[PDB]
Each structure stands twice: as structure tokens, then as C-alpha cells.
Design a protein around this ligand. Structure first.
Ligand code: HEM
Length: 390
């Protein structure tokens, strides 16, 4: 047992274990033992982490139903993000035609209404309130629903199931099938009314004579929903808790808002998007990675935080600066698996702070900052409550 047990981290708050920044600033490649599957390499530098996303000598296809190192015991499922060419660069090519940077910016108007909408009842109801449930937690579902085309009537019955996928199996997989068949149904309707919708234009999207089949269509559909619900809530709620930890940095925004774009990529990079590392990638060829030489069939996991705070790429890398002349962060990913939610995450977080920071200037923690509790759950860090007062 050269390799330390990965059960080493803790998601107490938005803290990261020091190993990541010792390994980066010394041992190119570090080795740790995952509780399930074997042991695995741990890339931590900007250099290596960038590579693990982009190097075709790193298959993620070759993880479908394999005994690979991991943190969960569930063995993952043919998804856009466990594919590789030519299947991935075909699926994603067809989808990106419907899920354009245009369509997602055109959502900004609606997204305004919805933030305004939420602080409105949130203000109306009286302080103290709790932003996770009260405003950040729904904003992104209401925005995902609008994107796909989920009609107003079915909207509150969508949240029914979409939140039944967290607490049993005879209700989550009920909620599974209940949402598969609901979406497959809804797509059928967009083929009838060939809309200016996203489900509308995924059908109508064709590369030469290629098209998405019922199970690629529904499969892609459902994947947005899971990608964009729980991680846009947590992008927001945390980013606030952080912004509120640096009042220095609020006033700079509050009494200036031309920086909302630049401050979001900033607030992303600085904040860990997960409590553990990533979904271990598999070397299909021998590739020297950050000094050490990953043998083919050997596994490696990317930590983004350490990449995003690499003193080799970021000057003053642990201070928050909204004036950074350039921000090549990894929080939203790199290469041909660039987050396709990207444009929407930016227009959501911008206008969500864009609003809150103005519409509630004197918005402050209700309870001592130390006393705010985080979920002892898993995957990415979540806020039990974000109790605020005004
Ligand atoms: C709001 C709607 C969102 C949608 C619809 C969405 C969808 C996706 C999809 C489909 C991918 C995989 C792309 C591919 O392999 O072809 C992706 C990647 C990614 N998304 Fe999102 N996303 C969203 C928001 C976010 C947010 C808020 C975060 C916050 C951290 C995030 C983090 C990531 C990361 C890190 C990747 C890297 C993919 C990889 O290399 O494995 N996404 N997103």
C-alpha cells in the first residue's frame, strides 16, 4: 500500500484538502487508492488536467460497465460524456446545432423575469428567508423547463418527478420512467408543431443524412435536465455564500455591475465544483503525465480546483480578482467535452447575482457564517440552507 486511501477529503464547507496543492507543487503525478475498484493516478496541475480532457490516448468510452476506480459502488449508461469519436463527435455535433450559444443567450430576457419574480415573493414573505429553497434551487429548473419546451401546465408536475430523482427506489425510478415517457411524449408533439423550441430543433437537426433516433433525442433531452438542475443551484447558492464572505468584493460589484460577467468565471474557478475528484479516465496508450508515465489500462482522475489555482497559469491564484486579463479556468471543462450548458450557466449566474446584489443591497447572513451548515451528502458541495436577512 504505497497509495494513500482517497477517503481523505471532507466537504465541511468550501474547503479543499492540501494534498492537491502539495502534489501539484511537487509530485507531478500522485497515487491514491479509491474505496471501490483499484487505485488510480490523480492529475492536479493545469498542464496535466488540460491534457486528460484533450488527449485521445485517454478513453472514457472504455469505462462503460468496467471495474474502474471510483468513490460510489454503482458501476456506470451510454451518455455524451462517456463517449469518444466517432460516436461522441457525431452525437454532440448534431445536438450543438439545436443547443447553440445564440438560443441560450436569447433565454436572458425570460431569466430576468424569473429572478425578479423570485426575490419578489422572497421579499414579500419577510426576512429571515433561505435562498437555496426560496430562490436558488428553483431558478434553474424553471429555466431548464423553458429551454426544452415543458408547457406551463406540466411545469409543477415536472418538479414532482425531477426532484423525486434526489428517497426510495420505488419512487426515484418511478420518477425515472415517469420522466423518460413524459419527455419522449413531449418530443413527439414538437415533431407535430415544428417549433422554434430546443426539442423542436433537435428533431430538425441533421448532418448530411444523419439524425438523432428516439433514444438519442430523449437521451440527450433527459441529460440536459440532470446536468442543469442540481449544479446551477449549487453554482449560485455557494457563489453567494462566497461573495458574502468577501464584502470587500460585493461593494466592488454592487457599486459597479459591468464586472458581473468577469466575476462569474472568477467565482467559478475559485470554488470547488466537487468534494471528490473526477470520473477516472483510462489510458488506451502509454502517456507521460506530469512527470510520471501512465501505463495503458492504468487510470487517472482530474481535480479542477488545483488546475484552476495553478500558480503556473494564475498569478495571485488564491486571491479573487474581477479584472483578470484572461481566465482559462477548467470549472466548465476543456476540449470537445466543453460544457454545452456553458452559455446558459453564464446568463443564469450573471442575472441571478446581477439581480440579488442590487434588488437587495443590505442582503447579509441571518446567522453567524460559521453556523451556516453544508450537506453531509456527496458528489458536489451543497448548502443545507443559506439563511439571509435584509
Ligand atoms: C445549466 C445547464 C447545463 C447543461 C444543460 C449542461 C450540460 C452539459 C453537457 C451535456 C456536458 C457534456 C458535454 C459533452 O460531453 O458533449 C457538460 C459538461 C460539463 N458541465 Fe455542464 N451543463 C450545464 C451546467 C453546468 C454547470 C452549472 C456546471 C458547473 C460546474 C457544469 C459543469 C460541467 C463540466 C465541468 C463539464 C465537463 C464535461 C466533461 O469533460 O466530463 N455544467 N455539461
Amino acid at each position: 500500500g504505497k497509495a494513500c486511501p482517497y477517503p481523505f477529503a471532507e466537504m465541511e464547507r468550501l474547503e479543499i484538502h492540501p494534498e492537491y496543492n502539495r502534489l501539484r507543487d511537487a509530485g507531478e503525478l500522485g497515487r491514491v487508492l479509491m474505496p471501490y475498484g483499484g487505485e488510480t493516478w490523480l492529475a492536479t496541475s493545469w498542464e496535466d488536467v488540460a491534457k486528460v480532457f484533450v488527449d485521445p490516448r485517454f478513453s472514457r468510452s472504455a469505462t462503460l460497465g468496467k471495474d474502474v476506480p471510483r468513490v460510489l459502488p454503482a458501476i456506470q449508461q451510454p451518455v455524451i460524456m462517456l463517449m469518444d469519436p466517432p460516436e461522441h463527435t457525431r452525437l454532440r455535433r448534431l445536438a450543438t446545432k439545436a443547443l447553440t450559444s445564440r438560443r441560450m443567450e436569447a433565454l436572458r430576457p425570460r431569466t430576468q423575469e424569473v429572478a425578479d419574480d423570485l426575490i419578489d415573493k422572497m421579499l414579500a414573505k419577510g426576512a429571515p428567508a433561505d435562498l437555496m429553497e426560496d430562490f436558488a434551487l428553483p431558478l434553474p429548473i424553471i429555466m431548464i423547463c423553458e429551454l426544452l419546451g415543458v408547457p406551463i401546465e406540466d411545469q409543477t408536475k415536472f418538479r414532482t418527478w425531477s426532484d423525486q430523482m434526489l428517497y426510495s427506489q420505488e419512487v426515484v425510478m418511478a420518477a425515472g420512467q415517469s420522466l423518460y415517457l413524459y419527455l419522449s411524449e413531449l418530443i413527439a408533439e414538437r415533431r407535430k408543431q415544428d417549433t422554434n423550441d430546443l426539442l423542436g430543433s433537435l428533431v430538425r437537426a441533421r448532418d448530411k443524412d444523419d439524425r438523432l433516433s428516439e433514444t438519442e433525442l430523449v437521451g440527450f433531452a433527459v441529460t440536459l435536465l440532470i446536468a442543469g438542475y442540481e449544479t446551477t443551484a449549487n453554482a449560485i447558492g455557494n457563489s453567494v455564500y462566497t461573495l458574502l464572505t468577501h464584502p470587500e468584493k460585493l461593494a466592488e460589484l454592487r457599486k459597479d455591475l459591468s464586472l458581473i460577467p468577469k466575476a462569474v468565471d472568477e467565482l467559478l474557478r475559485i470554488i470547488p465544483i466537487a468534494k471528490q475528484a473526477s470520473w477516472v479516465r483510462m489510458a488506451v496508450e502509454d502517456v507521460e503525465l506530469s512527470g510520471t508515465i501512465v501505463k495503458a489500462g492504468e487510470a487517472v482522475a482530474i481535480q479542477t480546483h488545483s488546475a484552476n489555482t495553478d500558480p503556473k497559469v494564475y498569478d495571485h491564484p488564491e486571491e479573487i480578482d474581477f479584472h483578470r486579463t484572461s481566465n482559462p479556468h477548467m470549472s466548465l471543462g476543456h476540449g470537445a467535452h466543453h460544457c454545452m450548458g456553458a452559455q446558459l450557466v453564464r446568463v443564469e449566474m450573471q442575472t441571478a447575482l446581477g439581480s440579488l446584489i442590487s434588488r437587495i443591497p443590505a442582503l447579509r447572513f441571518a446567522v453567524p457564517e460559521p453556523r451556516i451548515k453544508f450537506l453531509r451528502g456527496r458528489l458536489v458541495p451543497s448548502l443545507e440552507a443559506l439563511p439571509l436577512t435584509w
